[PDB]
């Protein structure tokens, strides 16, 4: 768990997975990929947010990798760096 937290209620993988209960199954990215990469569903469209950095992303397409998208849009996220390392984030 990172020092910095934007949504303490979503600190656990289990809480983040729980938000995907009503995730549209037509979206081509799996809930476990998103939750593992720090993301939870905010309940509208395919909108998600990271529990650590509060970074928000939508319009998930086939082939999107949540870790790669996390590092390109929110490269200074503390959770991202603790999980994947400085070396993974361009």
């Amino acid at each position: 768990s990172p020092e910095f937290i934007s949504n303490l209620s979503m600190q656990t993988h289990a809480a983040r997975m729980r938000t995907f209960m009503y995730w549209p199954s037509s979206v081509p990215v799996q809930p476990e990929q998103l939750a593992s990469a720090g993301f939870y569903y905010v309940g509208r469209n395919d909108d998600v947010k990271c529990f650590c950095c509060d970074g928000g992303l939508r319009c998930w397409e086939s082939g999107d990798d949540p870790w790669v998208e996390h590092a390109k849009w929110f490269p200074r996220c503390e959770f991202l760096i603790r999980m994947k390392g400085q070396e993974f984030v361009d």
């Binding site: 992303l57 939508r58 319009c59 849009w73």
Partner: peptide
């Protein structure tokens, strides 16, 4: 994916 894009930012909101």
């Amino acid at each position: 994916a894009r930012t909101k």
